[PDB]
Design an enzyme around this catalytic site. Structure first.
Site, PDB file in Angstrom:
ATOM      1  N   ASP A   1       7.444   6.682  -2.877  1.00  0.00           N
ATOM      2  CA  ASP A   1       6.588   5.588  -3.333  1.00  0.00           C
ATOM      3  C   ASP A   1       6.239   5.868  -4.778  1.00  0.00           C
ATOM      4  O   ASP A   1       5.167   6.387  -5.074  1.00  0.00           O
ATOM      5  CB  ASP A   1       5.327   5.418  -2.448  1.00  0.00           C
ATOM      6  CG  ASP A   1       4.709   4.025  -2.572  1.00  0.00           C
ATOM      7  OD1 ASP A   1       5.331   3.126  -3.196  1.00  0.00           O
ATOM      8  OD2 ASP A   1       3.598   3.823  -2.042  1.00  0.00           O
TER       9      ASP A   1
ATOM     10  N   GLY B   1      -6.261  -1.742  -3.412  1.00  0.00           N
ATOM     11  CA  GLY B   1      -6.421  -1.973  -4.840  1.00  0.00           C
ATOM     12  C   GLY B   1      -6.239  -0.728  -5.696  1.00  0.00           C
ATOM     13  O   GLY B   1      -5.886  -0.846  -6.847  1.00  0.00           O
TER      14      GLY B   1
ATOM     15  N   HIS C   1       5.657   0.476  -3.920  1.00  0.00           N
ATOM     16  CA  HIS C   1       5.207  -0.489  -2.914  1.00  0.00           C
ATOM     17  C   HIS C   1       4.380  -1.611  -3.542  1.00  0.00           C
ATOM     18  O   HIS C   1       4.235  -2.685  -2.956  1.00  0.00           O
ATOM     19  CB  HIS C   1       4.463   0.214  -1.750  1.00  0.00           C
ATOM     20  CG  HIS C   1       2.982   0.338  -1.920  1.00  0.00           C
ATOM     21  ND1 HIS C   1       2.344   1.558  -2.040  1.00  0.00           N
ATOM     22  CD2 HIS C   1       2.005  -0.598  -1.937  1.00  0.00           C
ATOM     23  CE1 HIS C   1       1.042   1.362  -2.132  1.00  0.00           C
ATOM     24  NE2 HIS C   1       0.811   0.059  -2.085  1.00  0.00           N
TER      25      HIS C   1
ATOM     26  N   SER D   1      -3.923   1.656  -5.154  1.00  0.00           N
ATOM     27  CA  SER D   1      -2.536   2.130  -5.068  1.00  0.00           C
ATOM     28  C   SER D   1      -1.889   2.178  -6.445  1.00  0.00           C
ATOM     29  O   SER D   1      -2.167   1.355  -7.282  1.00  0.00           O
ATOM     30  CB  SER D   1      -1.720   1.243  -4.129  1.00  0.00           C
ATOM     31  OG  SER D   1      -2.251   1.227  -2.804  1.00  0.00           O
TER      32      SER D   1
HETATM   33  C1  LIG Z   1      -6.361  -1.737   8.678  1.00  0.00           C
HETATM   34  O1  LIG Z   1      -5.712  -0.525   8.273  1.00  0.00           O
HETATM   35  C2  LIG Z   1      -5.499  -0.209   6.944  1.00  0.00           C
HETATM   36  N1  LIG Z   1      -6.554  -0.025   6.096  1.00  0.00           N
HETATM   37  C3  LIG Z   1      -6.368   0.295   4.792  1.00  0.00           C
HETATM   38  C4  LIG Z   1      -5.074   0.440   4.271  1.00  0.00           C
HETATM   39  C5  LIG Z   1      -4.830   0.771   2.816  1.00  0.00           C
HETATM   40  N2  LIG Z   1      -5.091   2.019   2.354  1.00  0.00           N
HETATM   41  C6  LIG Z   1      -4.882   2.347   1.043  1.00  0.00           C
HETATM   42  C7  LIG Z   1      -5.204   3.747   0.621  1.00  0.00           C
HETATM   43  O2  LIG Z   1      -4.694   4.166  -0.389  1.00  0.00           O
HETATM   44  N3  LIG Z   1      -6.051   4.440   1.394  1.00  0.00           N
HETATM   45  C8  LIG Z   1      -6.461   5.691   1.206  1.00  0.00           C
HETATM   46  N4  LIG Z   1      -6.030   6.400   0.165  1.00  0.00           N
HETATM   47  N5  LIG Z   1      -7.256   6.198   2.045  1.00  0.00           N
HETATM   48  C9  LIG Z   1      -4.368   1.401   0.155  1.00  0.00           C
HETATM   49  N6  LIG Z   1      -4.129   1.643  -1.155  1.00  0.00           N
HETATM   50  N7  LIG Z   1      -4.116   0.162   0.604  1.00  0.00           N
HETATM   51  C10 LIG Z   1      -4.335  -0.175   1.897  1.00  0.00           C
HETATM   52  N8  LIG Z   1      -4.030  -1.454   2.226  1.00  0.00           N
HETATM   53  C11 LIG Z   1      -4.003   0.243   5.153  1.00  0.00           C
HETATM   54  O3  LIG Z   1      -2.719   0.343   4.693  1.00  0.00           O
HETATM   55  C12 LIG Z   1      -1.755  -0.651   5.066  1.00  0.00           C
HETATM   56  N9  LIG Z   1      -4.228  -0.074   6.464  1.00  0.00           N
END
Ligand SMILES: COc1ncc(-c2nc(C(=O)NC(=N)N)c(N)nc2N)c(OC)n1
Length: 245
Positions: free
Chosen positions: A97, A196, A46, A198
């Site tokens: 992913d 960040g 992704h 990911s």
């Molecule tokens: C508004 O809601 C929302 N908030 C955060 C993410 C979010 N979460 C993660 C993640 O890995 N979170 C985790 N492990 N807990 C990521 N790498 N990147 C993102 N953008 C999201 O996902 C679309 N949506």
């Protein structure tokens, strides 16, 4: 990484920092990865799916900081960008992913190992730790969900494996999560991965060995109650990893 602690690359010498070239020569951070062999970094599909061209990306190894050079670091171009044929994007979830990057230097070389640059072992097939096992996650991602900036210094923290039966509940992620995914979280929801992070590693001690059990993939928010972090379950993709390498 929400919470946790700062660290340097020596503590997590397989961590890879992945960046993208911009039209107009900007270079922004994209995602973490893990060195699994001298010429191969593994990461999340992704991360790249919107800009799936290999000449746009740069990989660094032995780098502890986001926008400054770290002494001893090695910089690579992507000789090969492999995305998983079965990728799919859900509303939250990402299926399959997982991605591989083949790295070679301007001089045409792969990684030479060092104190700041080492490989991480992959798990044995279908072999994961018991839930409740503490594992560690590393990355340059946000320190808080509201932050605009990413930390300048690499961070890491601890989270515990959550059973699928438990992640599977509605209350939680319901059916969004699958057996090719893992969930991990802090009992207090106090620390987590965030935007960040990911593509970076989830590393667990397995048979007295540090092992790449997961790849940071998705989550709803960061560090919120009943919303663990979701990780690509590496022990379910070894033939894919083995073939494409
Ligand atoms: C508004 O809601 C929302 N908030 C955060 C993410 C979010 N979460 C993660 C993640 O890995 N979170 C985790 N492990 N807990 C990521 N790498 N990147 C993102 N953008 C999201 O996902 C679309 N949506």
């Amino acid at each position: 990484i929400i919470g946790g602690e700062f660290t340097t690359i020596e503590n997590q010498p397989w961590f890879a920092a992945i960046y993208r070239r911009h039209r107009g020569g900007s270079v922004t951070y994209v995602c973490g990865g893990s060195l699994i062999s001298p010429c191969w970094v593994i990461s999340a599909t992704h991360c790249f799916i919107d800009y799936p061209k290999k000449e746009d990306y740069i990989v660094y190894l032995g780098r502890s900081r986001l926008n400054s050079n770290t002494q001893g670091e090695m910089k690579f171009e992507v000789e090969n960008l492999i995305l998983h044929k079965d990728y799919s994007a859900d509303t939250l979830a990402h299926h399959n992913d997982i991605a591989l990057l083949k790295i070679r230097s301007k001089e045409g070389r792969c990684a030479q190992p060092s104190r700041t640059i080492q490989t991480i072992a992959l798990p044995s097939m279908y072999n994961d730790p018991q839930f409740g096992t503490s594992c560690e996650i590393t990355g340059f991602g946000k320190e808080q969900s509201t932050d605009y900036l990413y930390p300048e210094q690499l961070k890491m923290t601890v989270v515990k494996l959550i059973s699928h039966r438990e992640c599977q509940q509605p209350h939680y992620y319901g059916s969004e999560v699958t057996t090719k995914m893992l969930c991990a979280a802090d009992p207090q929801w106090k620390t987590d991965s965030c935007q960040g992070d990911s593509g970076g590693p989830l590393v667990c001690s397995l048979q007295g060995r540090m092992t790449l059990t997961g790849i940071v993939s998705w989550g709803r928010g960061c560090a919120l109650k009943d919303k663990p972090g979701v990780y690509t379950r590496v022990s379910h993709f070894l033939p894919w990893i083995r073939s494409h390498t």
